[PDB]
């Protein structure tokens, strides 16, 4: 079989075949000649230029290419043009298997409209509210009391969240209807309002579904997709805390009942919104192969890929709802190349200087091997880290530990945000909401700080590392074994903390306050000039990272955050006070081209916003295109140098004001 995706899922598929003993083929674009899925595959064929359209999206190339492998079936994947009719039609022109759902169900359910029809076909507890215009305030109050809901005032013709106000009491109902009619009459030319059961605070619970072309339909355990930034989810978890069998059993039964309704074959997944009063709302249903199943597979072992490919041959499944159980729970997170602390700045075109994944009792699905890069015109996802567990505390701690052991170098990421979110006591309380993120991050993003004991431990580990790397340079036995260091982070030596060290063995020290002070005998295990640093005092265990140094300042990472600790002796400490600290030039002015050349491409527009790290234009000289970018600034005021202006000579190409 041949896949249709070029991400982690492709690798997953070419991995499921291992046990299924199925030879696999994987196509690629020109830029992806070095992707892992190309080498993992048994066969590879090029699909032209790497721009999205020609790459994979070029059905004609793809369907035509499906004539040499011999494979009797070809996976549709989950992204790009997966589950598409124009594609399903073409594949049934050449009479080949789709390894996916049937057309009628797909167009009946994935369609934007008429989904409410199928929803109300059997009702299935669809959105509740007075189905019609509320012409009077009396009707609005009466229908609000009917269910005593937060009103969910929404315009009949309005969409996207415009014309919506949340009413909690009758006076609020009247005032918000007065505002809503005024807003909607001006904005959408419709005064027709509707009132529905608004949700106190949503959790966005999701229910998984599987089926088959013969029978033995099964309901998979539900999942969580509460956390969501810009309508994109981050953290997922299958057995949500607010789970009662009274609801859940009916959820599975109703999902299976809806399944046969449209004769769905390859079930996508069911979407719900759940309030603390344990309701459910079948709508916004999915018909795509969601790849958040690893979590469910961790709590079940139900290999969705194997079962769906088995059903693609008109055979029933190998599992029934009778044996499906729960053996704990799993947590999954997504690693993006999106720089959060810097206003969510995108960082692309950077191959991995060097990276190593966490592999301690955890699972990681990724398509980015060492020496791989991310283009602008693709998904900036790095890895899909998922860890098995049985208890919240157990599963989370694992994630905590596994986050710190993920070495990524060569480009930014959002691991700090994931770490801070997981460590927050609100997240460990047990329950969350969908507005959780912006509720806990009002102004931008700011990572939480360190407690006193954590900073002390970081100091101790830094001193141990300094001594261990110092002993390497000495010759033969003429080496020291004890010092007294003065650690102080910050440019002003904030909190000078005297530290000792003794190095009793290769990976054991006798850290103390100073000489003639009680000693603790911690342990540090670190390979010289490497990232990972495992330190264990008593039971507590920590993992820190070592970035680099200039022999007075150490670049060490603590809880997914970079710091610069200063490790200096008595003389250096007493002398660093008497050192000039000059301030570098802070110039917000025009930028000039360093060398002569020709401008062939421009990226930014005249007199608009500019952010740090953004490419601006590209000169070509002596057969070579450079690319001077914007180091750092907010905006510009200038006149653009036109295309093909072979002038340069250190002119003012862009002027920053």
């Amino acid at each position: 079989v041949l896949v249709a995706n070029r991400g982690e899922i492709a690798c997953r598929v070419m991995a499921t075949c291992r046990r299924l003993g199925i030879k696999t083929v994987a196509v690629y674009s020109t830029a992806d000649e070095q992707a892992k899925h190309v080498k993992v595959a048994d066969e590879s064929v090029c699909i032209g230029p790497p721009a999205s359209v020609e790459s994979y999206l070029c059905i004609d190339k793809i369907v035509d290419a499906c004539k040499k492998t011999g494979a009797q079936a070809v996976h549709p994947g989950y992204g790009f043009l997966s589950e598409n009719g124009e594609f399903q039609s073409a594949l049934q022109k050449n009479n080949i298997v789709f390894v996916g759902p049937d057309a009628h169900s797909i167009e009946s359910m994935g369609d934007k409209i008429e989904s409410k029809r199928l929803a109300q076909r059997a009702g299935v507890t669809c959105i509740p509210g007075f189905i019609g215009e509320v012409k009077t305030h009396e009707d609005l109050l009466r229908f609000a009391r009917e269910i005593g809901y937060p009103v969910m005032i929404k315009a009949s013709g309005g969409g996207g969240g415009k014309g919506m106000r949340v009413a909690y009491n009758d006076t609020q109902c009247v005032e918000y209807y007065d505002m809503c009619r005024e807003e909607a009459k001006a904005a959408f030319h419709s005064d027709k309002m509707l009132v529905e059961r608004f949700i106190d605070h949503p959790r966005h619970i999701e229910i998984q579904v599987i089926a088959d072309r013969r029978g033995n339909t099964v309901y998979l355990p539900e999942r969580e997709c509460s956390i969501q930034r810009r309508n994109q989810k981050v953290i997922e978890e299958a057995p949500s805390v607010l789970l009662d069998a009274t609801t859940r059993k009916a959820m599975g039964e109703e999902a299976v009942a809806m399944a046969r309704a449209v004769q769905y074959v390859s079930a996508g997944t069911v979407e719900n919104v759940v309030n603390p009063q344990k309701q459910f709302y079948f709508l916004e249903m999915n018909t795509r192969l969601q790849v958040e199943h690893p979590i469910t597979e961790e709590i079940t072992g139900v290999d969705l890929v194997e079962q769906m490919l088995r059903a693609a041959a008109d055979l029933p499944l190998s599992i029934t709802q009778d044996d499906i159980t729960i053996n704990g729970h799993a947590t999954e997170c997504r690693v993006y190349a999106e720089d959060p602390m810097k206003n969510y700045f995108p960082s692309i075109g950077r191959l991995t200087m060097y990276q190593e994944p966490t592999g301690a009792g955890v699972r990681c699905d990724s398509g980015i091997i060492e020496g791989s890069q991310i283009s602008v015109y693709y998904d900036p996802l790095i890895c899909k880290l998922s860890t098995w567990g049985r208890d919240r505390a157990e599963c989370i701690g694992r994630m905590e530990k596994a986050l710190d052991e993920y070495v990524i170098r060569g480009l930014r990421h959002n691991i700090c945000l994931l770490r801070d979110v997981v460590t927050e006591p609100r997240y460990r309380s047990g329950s969350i909401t969908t507005n959780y993120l912006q509720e806990q991050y009002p102004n931008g993003f700011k990572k939480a700080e360190l407690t006193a004991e954590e900073m002390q431990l970081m100091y101790e580990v830094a001193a141990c590392v300094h001594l261990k790397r110092e002993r390497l340079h000495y010759t033969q036995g003429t080496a020291p074994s004890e010092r007294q260091l003065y650690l102080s982070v910050g440019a002003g030596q904030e909190g000078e903390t005297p530290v000792y060290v003794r190095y009793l063995d290769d990976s054991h020290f006798e850290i103390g306050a100073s000489k003639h002070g009680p000693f603790r005998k911690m342990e540090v295990v670190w390979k010289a000039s490497y990232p990972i640093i495992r330190v264990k005092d008593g039971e507590a265990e920590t993992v820190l990272q070592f970035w680099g140094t200039n022999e007075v300042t150490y670049g060490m990472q603590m809880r997914g955050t970079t710091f610069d600790v200063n490790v200096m002796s008595d003389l250096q400490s007493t002398l660093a006070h008497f050192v000039p600290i000059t301030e570098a030039t802070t110039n917000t002015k025009q930028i000039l081209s360093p060398m002569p050349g020709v401008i062939v491409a421009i990226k930014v527009q005249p007199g608009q916003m500019v952010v740090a790290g953004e490419e601006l234009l590209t000169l070509e000289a002596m057969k070579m295109r450079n690319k001077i970018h914007a180091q750092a600034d907010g905006k510009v005021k200038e006149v653009k140098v036109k295309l093909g202006a072979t002038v340069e000579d250190n002119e003012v190409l862009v002027e920053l004001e």
């Binding site: 490497y530 200039n550 022999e551 660093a576 008497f578 000289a621 057969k623």
Partner: protein, 489 residues
């Protein structure tokens, strides 16, 4: 007790003794001479004698290995040299010539001492002669912590490496007063000879540091690389890194387009051991990189082009930089590893008006004269005389390697097509340039001739380099008998 140094620190500056204490080991400095006077007897100098006479000379010890050093003192007479100051320095250099030990000096002198007359010139001449004679015998490093003017500037110049401190140091031959007197332009001391000027414009300073503390901390690290003398072998340090570490990221560094640029450090860093690069002259002639690095625990010399800056084109400044680095590396038996990516020489009238012919020959002379083991890797391209200059196999090179997408040709395809068909029918571009580039802009022809040993996968570079550098440990080559060469100055 912190007497007499409060006046110094109040100006945000350190003292000579404090610098010496910071450089060496905690308790291994033994000051040599401390009670010496100037015995001048002129211009009312018979009084105000000083015990130290403005110099601190000792022995010290760094990383368990011996050293010699001296430091000027700015408080006493402004650091001026004399018939008596220079005697201590001469004695130290002579002793460090008998024993195979290097010398490091921290310059702070304000100029010559006028009250001694021509005795200051005598001392300067003796120091110059010692530097000239002992260059190439023991490594010499110089750091400039404060003002350095007059004719005293020449002795740091002859030394192998000169470093500078950022805020409070400068160096030049003639002061701005004379410049105003003759030309009439008002230029400040920093605008004339500041650390930035010598870092970027003149190319004299080999580096710049932000503070004295950082200067000492990194000077120790630099010292950890050098061999002790001319006859001593290259130092080898223990290291947990191993030649079997996987480097497969090199397969993707070179883009598939011939007009796109990349950073050569992405090729340099994987091959060498982790966090073991010490760049030399980082802000001058950025199209070429030179420095020191370790390969399997032994120090080597690195010289590579960079297509990031000016398409990696050789030039005057790059030629001088590479020539000096190669000469120093060969003088002390240090292996050389080079990475080649050059389209040719920089074209321009200013270049010929500035003597490209002289300067470009220096790098070729340095590469041909060298007798240390050499390893060369051609990543993408090498054209014209630039291929010859950058350690080609014919210049007694030990082992040469190429990557599968390399190109070695006489010149670009356009010029060859033009010269090979004078008045051939128009549109000849499309069906001739492509064919010529396909047939002869590839390493197959150069491999057929025997100019590259083998064509290797980019993932095997570390393995090959470690193997070759281990095997070549005991090469013995000698040049014909000469009093000395005649390099194109």
């Amino acid at each position: 007790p912190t007497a007499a140094e409060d006046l110094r620190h109040k100006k945000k500056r350190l003292t000579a003794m404090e610098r010496v204490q910071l450089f060496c080991d905690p308790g291994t400095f033994r000051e040599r001479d401390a009670l010496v006077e100037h015995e001048c007897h002129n211009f009312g100098m018979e009084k105000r004698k000083v015990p130290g006479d403005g110099f601190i000379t000792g022995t010290g010890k760094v990383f368990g290995r011996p050293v010699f050093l001296f430091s000027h003192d700015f408080t006493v007479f402004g650091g001026s040299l004399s018939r008596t100051n220079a005697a201590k320095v001469v004695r130290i250099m002579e002793e460090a010539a008998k024993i195979g030990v290097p010398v490091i000096g921290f310059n702070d002198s304000g100029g010559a001492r006028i009250h001694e007359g021509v005795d200051s010139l005598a001392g300067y001449a003796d120091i110059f002669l010692r530097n000239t004679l002992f260059s190439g015998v023991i490594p010499q490093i110089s750091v400039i912590m404060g003002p350095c003017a007059g004719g005293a500037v020449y002795s740091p110049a002859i030394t192998d490496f000169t470093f500078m401190v950022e805020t409070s140091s400068y160096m030049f031959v003639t002061g701005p007063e004379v410049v105003s007197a003759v030309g009439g332009k008002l230029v400040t001391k920093d605008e004339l000879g500041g650390p930035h000027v010598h870092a970027t414009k003149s190319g004299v300073s080999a580096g710049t540091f932000p503070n004295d503390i950082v200067a000492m901390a990194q000077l120790r690290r630099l010292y950890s690389y050098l061999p002790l003398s001319n006859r001593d072998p290259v130092p080898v340090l223990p290291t947990a890194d191993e030649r079997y570490r996987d480097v497969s990221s090199l397969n993707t560094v070179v883009p598939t387009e011939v007009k796109e640029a990349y950073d050569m450090r992405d090729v340099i860093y994987p091959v060498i051991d982790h966090d073991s690069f010490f760049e030399i002259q980082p802000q001058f002639a950025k199209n070429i990189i030179c420095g020191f690095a370790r390969v399997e625990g032994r120090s080597v010399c690195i010289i590579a082009n960079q297509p990031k800056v000016q398409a990696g084109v050789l030039d005057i400044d790059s030629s001088v930089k590479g020539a000096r680095m190669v000469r120093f590396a060969d003088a002390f038996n240090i292996p050389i590893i080079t990475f080649v990516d050059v389209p040719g020489f920089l074209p321009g009238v200013q270049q010929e008006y500035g003597g490209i012919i002289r300067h470009g020959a220096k790098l070729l002379y340095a590469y041909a004269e060298a007798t240390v083991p050499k390893v060369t890797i051609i990543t993408r391209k090498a054209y014209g005389g630039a291929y010859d200059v950058m350690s080609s196999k014919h210049l007694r090179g030990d082992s040469n390697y190429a990557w599968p997408h390399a190109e070695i040709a006489v010149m670009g395809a356009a010029g060859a097509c033009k010269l090979l068909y004078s008045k051939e029918t128009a549109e000849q571009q499309a069906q001739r340039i492509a064919d010529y580039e396909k047939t002869f802009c590839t390493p197959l022809s150069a491999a057929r001739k025997g100019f590259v040993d083998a064509v290797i996968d980019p993932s095997e570079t570390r393995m090959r380099v470690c193997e070759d550098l281990e095997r070549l440990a005991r090469k013995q080559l000698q040049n014909p008998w000469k009093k000395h060469g005649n390099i194109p100055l």
